Symmetry: D2
Amino acid sequence: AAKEVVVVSGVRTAIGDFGGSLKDFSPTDLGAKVVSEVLSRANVSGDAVGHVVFGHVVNTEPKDMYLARVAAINGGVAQHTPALTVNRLCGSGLQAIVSAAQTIMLGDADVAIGGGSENMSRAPYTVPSARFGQRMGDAKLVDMMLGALHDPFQTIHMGVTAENVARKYGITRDAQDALALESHRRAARAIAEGRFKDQILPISIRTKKGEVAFDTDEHVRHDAGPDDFTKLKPVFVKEDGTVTAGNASGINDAAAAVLMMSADAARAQGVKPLARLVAYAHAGVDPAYMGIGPVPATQKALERAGLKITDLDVIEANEAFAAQACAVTQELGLDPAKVNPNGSGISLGHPIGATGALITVKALYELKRIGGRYALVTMCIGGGQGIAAIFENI
Amino acid sequence: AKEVVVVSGVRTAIGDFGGSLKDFSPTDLGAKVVSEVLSRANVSGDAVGHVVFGHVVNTEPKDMYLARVAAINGGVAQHTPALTVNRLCGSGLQAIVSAAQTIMLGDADVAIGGGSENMSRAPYTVPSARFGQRMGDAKLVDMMLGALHDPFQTIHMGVTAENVARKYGITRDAQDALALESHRRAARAIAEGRFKDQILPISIRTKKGEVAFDTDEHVRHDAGPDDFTKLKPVFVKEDGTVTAGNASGINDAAAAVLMMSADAARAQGVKPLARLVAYAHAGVDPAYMGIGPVPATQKALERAGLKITDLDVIEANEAFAAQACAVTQELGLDPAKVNPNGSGISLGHPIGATGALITVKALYELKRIGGRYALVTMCIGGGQGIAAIFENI
Amino acid sequence: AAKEVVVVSGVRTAIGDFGGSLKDFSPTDLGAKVVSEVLSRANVSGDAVGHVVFGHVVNTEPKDMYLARVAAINGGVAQHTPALTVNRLCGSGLQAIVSAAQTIMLGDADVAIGGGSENMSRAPYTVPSARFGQRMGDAKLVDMMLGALHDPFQTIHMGVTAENVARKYGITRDAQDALALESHRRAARAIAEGRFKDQILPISIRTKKGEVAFDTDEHVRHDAGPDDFTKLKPVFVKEDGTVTAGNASGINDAAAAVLMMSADAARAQGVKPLARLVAYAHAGVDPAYMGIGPVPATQKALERAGLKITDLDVIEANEAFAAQACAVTQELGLDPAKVNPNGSGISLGHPIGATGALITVKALYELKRIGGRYALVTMCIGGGQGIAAIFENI
Amino acid sequence: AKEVVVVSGVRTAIGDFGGSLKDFSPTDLGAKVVSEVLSRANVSGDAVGHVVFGHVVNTEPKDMYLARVAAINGGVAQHTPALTVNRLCGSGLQAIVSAAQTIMLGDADVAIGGGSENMSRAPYTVPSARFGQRMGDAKLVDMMLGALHDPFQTIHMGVTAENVARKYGITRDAQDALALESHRRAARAIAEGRFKDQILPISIRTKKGEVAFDTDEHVRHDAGPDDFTKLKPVFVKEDGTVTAGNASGINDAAAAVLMMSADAARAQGVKPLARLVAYAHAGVDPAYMGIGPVPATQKALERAGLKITDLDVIEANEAFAAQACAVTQELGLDPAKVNPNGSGISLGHPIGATGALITVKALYELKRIGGRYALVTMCIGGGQGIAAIFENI
Ligand SMILES: CC(C)(COP(=O)(O)OP(=O)(O)OC[C@H]1O[C@@H](n2cnc3c(N)ncnc32)[C@H](O)[C@@H]1OP(=O)(O)O)[C@@H](O)C(=O)NCCC(=O)NCCS
Ligand SMILES: CC(C)(COP(=O)(O)OP(=O)(O)OC[C@H]1O[C@@H](n2cnc3c(N)ncnc32)[C@H](O)[C@@H]1OP(=O)(O)O)[C@@H](O)C(=O)NCCC(=O)NCCS
Ligand SMILES: CC(C)(COP(=O)(O)OP(=O)(O)OC[C@H]1O[C@@H](n2cnc3c(N)ncnc32)[C@H](O)[C@@H]1OP(=O)(O)O)[C@@H](O)C(=O)NCCC(=O)NCCS
Ligand SMILES: CC(C)(COP(=O)(O)OP(=O)(O)OC[C@H]1O[C@@H](n2cnc3c(N)ncnc32)[C@H](O)[C@@H]1OP(=O)(O)O)[C@@H](O)C(=O)NCCC(=O)NCCS
C-alpha cells in the first residue's frame, strides 16, 4: 500500500499587492525564504530532505526555470536533494504538495518539501520577433501575465469563463458582491484577532526610511461596505456583466511551503505535526467553465477519503471569482460559514502559483485554531481543471 | 504500486535551431505526438487518466498551459487532468515518471508522458516593461541562453562541462572522438532506417510545395575526425576543450509515450512495447551537474536489483562529450551499448523533450536487438540526474 | 540688405515635470496648441503664414518626424505653408526662431512662425536588434532620452561637461547652490505676482476628478531654503563632484512659439508687437566644455548689434547647470540681477527642444514688464555649441 | 544676399535595405562625405562657417547630434556650428538651402550642406518602456515604416501616390514604362562610368577580404518590361497601380556639397562646380504630396527668371512612378532631360540624403553635357515640395 504522509510544518509570506510591498522580491528569493523557515519550524536539517517540489506559473527571469532548485539550495537544502518545478496553473501550489507527498507515498523519500512561489508584479513581457527580427511593420510586446490569465483555446480572460459559470449556475451580481464583501470582513477580523500571526513569515522590506517588516496581507479592505462593490462596473464583458474588480480575486505576490514526512519518520522523530494527508483528487472540465473544476475534484477526493461533505470542519476553496466560488459552494452543498472562514483570493489576494500551498497552510492552522478534524483544500484551474486534497488534524 | 507498461511511443524528427520546425509552437508539436500515441495504441481519447508534459522554455502564453493544450488538441477528453513539469534537461523523462506514478498509485489506468520544446522560438523578455525603466538603458533578456546558465554562478552549462573534464580526465581528443562516432552512429541509423518507425513525419509547408520533415537534420553524414579537431573551444578562453563540435546542439522537437496499468493493458488487447522497472533521482554539485547520471543510474540499478552488465541498451544523453565520456567512464559501461545510434551531439538536444525522445529510442532499439533491459538517463542543469530502467516485453 | 523682423506675438505652455502634468500630451499636440494661440494673439489668419519652423530633439513617435507640419496643420495653418523641423539640441527652440526669421530676412516670407516642442516624459526606448534580430545573447533597450543627454564624442552625460566647466572656471558647490536657490525664489515670486499669466496658454488636463487647467510651472519649489540644496549629493561624478539634482536643470515637457512678420507687413497691419530682432549669432566650442558656448555666441551677437553687455536690460541665459550658468555670467561680466530675473531651467525646467523658444517668450514679456529696451536670449548646446539672439522692445 | 557657389560635392553609392551599408551609421557616413568634400575643394577644416545635414530617422542617440558628429569626425573644427534639419524627403536639399542661406546672409563664407540616412538601421521603439505598460500587450513601433506614413490619415506614402495617379491620369502601363527606363538609364550610366567621379567608395569589410562598395546596388541591369507588369499592387487591395517595381526603394547613403561666397571662392583659387540661382518651397494637400514639386518648381523658375525650356538637366526624384509621371506631365518637361541617369526607382531613395545626393548628380551631369541650368526638386511627405536651380560655371 501507500505510505501515510504527515505534514509537520508550514509557513507563508504575507501576500503582496500587484506593484506592492513584495515587488522587488524575485520568486526564487521568496521560495528560498519559505524553505529555510519550514525547515526551522519542523526542526529538520537541510541535509535530510529527500525531495523538493515547487509550484510556479509565470517565469520572471531565467533563474525561475530552476525555481525549485534555487529555492532549495538558497533555502539551505543540501545539493544532493532533487528539486522539481511544476505548473498546473492556479492549482500549482497544491500540486507541488501532492507531488512531494507522492515521493513519500511511493517510498522515494521520507522527507519532502512542497511549496509555491509567484511574483506577478515581476511578470515580464516577451518580444517574439526579437531573436530573428521583424524586418518591417509593427510588432508586439506580449504580456506574459495577462497571457497566463487567458484560456488558450478561446483566448478569453479567466473572467469571461467566470461569467459563463455565473450564467449557468444562476449566480447574481448581488450574490457575488455579498461574497466579496464578506471575504474582506472575514480577512479583516482574522488580521485584527491575530489569526495569521503564527503562520506568516515576516519579510524585511528595505525602505528609504529604514527597514520595516511586511507581515500583513495588504490587499484586504478593512472598512469595506456594500456600496464599495455595488458602485463598480463589470470588467470582462461589455454586455450583461456581473464580474467586477471588486468581486474578482486580485493579482498578487507571495510564497508558501509545507514540510512533509512519512508517518514512520514523524513517529521516530517525535514531531508535533500539523496534519496528515487523507486523500487528493484531480478533475478536468469544460475550459469555458473552468471555475466549477473544484466540484468534481472535491467529490472524487471525498470518495477516496470515505468522507462526506458534512465531515469537513474547514474548507479553503480559493475565491478566484465570486461567480465561481459561489457556484462551487452551491453545487457541493457546503456551509458558507465553514468555507474560507478568514477570507480568500478576493480579499487576501491570489498569487497564482503559490495560492494552493498558501491556502493549505491557512487550512491547517485554522483546524488547530478551532480544534477541528478534517479540512478540504481545493481550487479551479485555467484550461478547465480542478484539484482537491483533504487533511486531518492530528 | 501497480505495474506500468508502455504500449506506444513516438517522436518527431529533431529540428535544428532556426531550422525545419522553427514555425511549430511547443503546444502544436505536443498535440501532434499526443494524437499519434493514442492512435498507435488504439486507445480512445476518452480513456486517459492523466497527461504530463516536460517543457522548460515558455515561448508564448499558451505554453504555460502546455500539457492541457497538447492533450485537448491531441484528442484527449476535457475530463483528463494535465500537468506541465520542469526538471530542466530531465523534464522529458520526469514527465514519463510522473505519469507512471499516477498509474502506480492507482489514480489512473492510462497516462501519457511526453516532452516538447522549441528553442528556436525561445523569447527575449523585458523585465522592466511592466512598470517601466524610467531612465537608463534596459536589458532585453535571452531566455534561451538564460536557461542554459547555471543559476548559482551564472556560467554556461558548457563551463560546468569543462569542470567535469578536468575532474575526471576527459581529453580534447577523447571528446572529439565520441563526437565523431556519435555522428557516424546517427548517420548509420538513418541510412539503415532505424528511426523510421519511431518518427512522426511533419509537413513543413515550403514554397517548393508540401515537404515532409522526417529526418533528424543535425546529423553530419560526411563527418571526419579533422572536422572536430579544427574547431576552437567556446566556453572558456584558455585551457579549454568543449567546442561547438563536441557539444550538443540547440534543437526543437516533441515526443510522448502512452502507458497503462498491467491490468488495463491486458483488458484491452494492446501489445505493450516494454515495462517500467525502476527510476531514481540524484542531486550533485551544480558546478559538476554533468556527472548527475552516475548516482541516479547507480540508485536505479539498486532499486531494480540489476547490474550494469544486465543493460542491453543505454540511452545516456550526450549534453557534452566532456560529460558523457565521464559518465560512461565512472559507471563502467560498454561504449558499444551506449547511444548505439547517436545522441545529443549528433541528433540534437531539444531540452524539455529530450528525456521523452530518448526513451522512445531506447525502447525501439530494444525491439531491434531482442534485448531485455534498457537504461535511460541524463544530466540536469543546476546539479541533478535522472534515470529509468525499462524491460522489453 | 536684410529685411527687419518683428516679433508680433508669443506664447508658451506652462512647463510640466518629468512624468508630470503634460505626460499624456504628445509633442505635436503641444505644438498645435501654441500655433493656434500665437495666430490668435497676432490676429493673423492661418491662411496668411509663409513658413513654420519648430525645434524638437527627441522623437517620441513617427508623427514627430513631421512635427512642424503637424503642429502647423493641426494649429490651423493652411496646407500651402511650408513647415520645417530643426534640431540643434538644447538650442533648437531659438534656432527655429532664427530660421523662421531668416525666411523673412531673405524675402521668402512676410509671415513666419518659430517655435519648439518637447515631451521628455514620452521619450522612447529603441530596440536596435529588433529589425534584423539578435539570434543569441542579451541585447539592450536604448534610452533615447538619456542618450540625447550624452556627449556623442566621449559618451559622458552633459552633467560631466558641467563639472569640467565648474573646474576650469572656478565655480564652487556653494556658488552653484546659491544660484539654484535664487532661481527657485525668483520663479516663486514671479508666480506669486502673476508675472507669467499673460504669456502662458492654459491646458485642460482631463483628470478623473474632472478637467483642470494646467497653467503654472510645476517644477518650482516655493518654500526652498539653503539646506535643501546642501544636503544633496553629486550625481554625475564619483569623485570631487559639485553638480547635483538640485543645481541641475530638470527634465521637462513644454511647447512655445512666436509669430514674426517683416517690418513692412507689421506696419501695414498696424500690429502692436512685442519686439524686433536685432541680431543673432552661433558659436562652436570644445564639446567637453559645451556649457560656456553662450560666451562666444553672446560676444558675436553683441558685435553684430553694435551693442555692449551694459546695454542689456534683460538676459535669458538658460540654466542648464548652475556650474555653467555661473561661468557664463562670470565670463561675460553680466549682472546676476538682470540674468534670469524670474528663474530658468533649474527652477522652471528645461524642455530641451522648446526651451530656446520658451525663454524668448519670457524675455520679451519681461522687457514689457520693466519698460526695458534690449534683451539677450542665449543657451548652451550639447556637442559644444552656443546660440544667442538680441531683441529690442518696440 | 551674397552669391553662393558650389566648389565641391560627393556622394556614397546607394545601399539597398539590409545591404552593403547596413553596418554604417548615419554619423559614420556623414563624416565620410564631410572629409571628402573638404579635400576635394582643398579647404581647411578650420575655415568652415557652418555645417547643415538633412536626416529623418534617428537610428541611435548620436543621430540627434548628426550634423555635429559628421562635422567633427569629418575634420571640421570645433568652432564651427552644426545643424540637423528635417523636411522629410526634402531634407537633403533643405540642408543645402539652409547652408546657402548662412552665406547669403553673411553669417559665413564657407558652409557644408549634406544629408545622411541609414534606413536599414532604422529602429523599433517601445513608447511604453519608460513608465511601463502595467497590463495588456504593448506595441513595438517600426519607426521606418512610421516615417513613410502620412501623419494626418496614417496611410502609406504609396497610397498618396495612388491618389495622384487617379487625379492626373497616370496608368499602370505608364508607371511601369518609367520604371523600366529609369533602370535602363541607371544601368547605362554605371556602364559608361558617369557616376565614377561623384561617388566616394567605401570599404565594406567582408569575410572574403576588403572589398570596395562604389556601385549603386539597387539597379537592375537586366530589366525587361515583363519584369514590372507581372508584379502586383502593394498599397491598395483593389483598383491599384503602385507596385514594388515602379516604386522607389528603401536605401542607405550620404552626400554633401561644400559652398562658399563668390568672394571667398575667388580669394582661394577654387574652380567652382556651379552657382546657386534660386530655391523655393511649396505646401500641398497631404493626400497628394507627390505633386509638391510642381508649384515649388514653378515658384523657383519665377524667382530665377527662367522657363522650363532653359533647364538642361532636371533631377526630379522618382518617389513613385505614379508621382514622377504627373510631375513631368504638369510642368511640361522633356522626359529625355529628366533623370537622364535614373533616380529613386532604380538608384534608390535614402530619404534624408536623397536631396543632397541628386544635387551632386545634377551638377556632375551639367559638366558632362556642357549645360547651363539644372533643376533639383522632390516631393515631401505631409504635403510639400522643394526646388532649387543651379548654374554651371
Ligand atoms: C479584475 C482585474 C482585471 C482588475 O485589475 P486592476 O485594475 O489592476 O485592479 P485594482 O485593484 O488595482 O483597480 C481596480 C479599481 O477598482 C477599485 N476597487 C477594487 N476593489 C474594490 C473594492 N473591494 N472596493 C472599492 N473599490 C475597489 C480600485 O480601487 C481601483 O480603483 P482606482 O483606480 O480608482 O484606484 C484584475 O484584478 C484581475 O484580472 N483579477 C483576476 C485575476 C485572475 O484571473 N486570477 C486567476 C483566475 S482563475
Ligand atoms: C556550442 C554552442 C554555443 C554553439 O552555438 P552556434 O555557434 O550558434 O551553432 P552553429 O552550428 O550554428 O555554429 C558553429 C559553427 O561550428 C561549426 N560546427 C558545429 N558543429 C560542427 C561539427 N560537428 N563539425 C564541424 N563543424 C561544426 C558550424 O558549421 C558552425 O560554423 P559556420 O557558422 O561557419 O557555419 C551551442 O550550440 C550550445 O550552446 N550547445 C550546447 C547546448 C546545451 O547547453 N544543452 C543543455 C546543457 S545540459
Ligand atoms: C540630475 C538628474 C539626473 C536627476 O534626475 P531625477 O532623479 O529623475 O530628478 P528628481 O527631481 O525627480 O529626483 C531628485 C531627487 O533630489 C531631490 N531634489 C531635487 N531637487 C531638489 C531641491 N531643489 N530641493 C530638495 N530636494 C531636491 C528630489 O526630491 C528627489 O528626491 P526624492 O527621490 O526623495 O523624491 C536629471 O534631472 C538631469 O539629468 N538633469 C539635467 C538634464 C540635462 O542634461 N539637460 C540638458 C543639459 S545641456
Ligand atoms: C514598395 C515596398 C513596400 C516594397 O518593399 P520590399 O517588399 O521589402 O522590397 P523587396 O525588393 O525586398 O521585395 C519586392 C519583391 O518584388 C520584386 N521586385 C522589386 N522590384 C522589382 C523590379 N524593378 N523588377 C522585378 N521585380 C522587382 C523583389 O525581387 C522582391 O521579390 P523577392 O522577395 O522574391 O526577391 C518598399 O520598397 C517601399 O515602401 N518603397 C517606397 C519607399 C517610400 O515610401 N519612399 C518615400 C516616399 S515619398
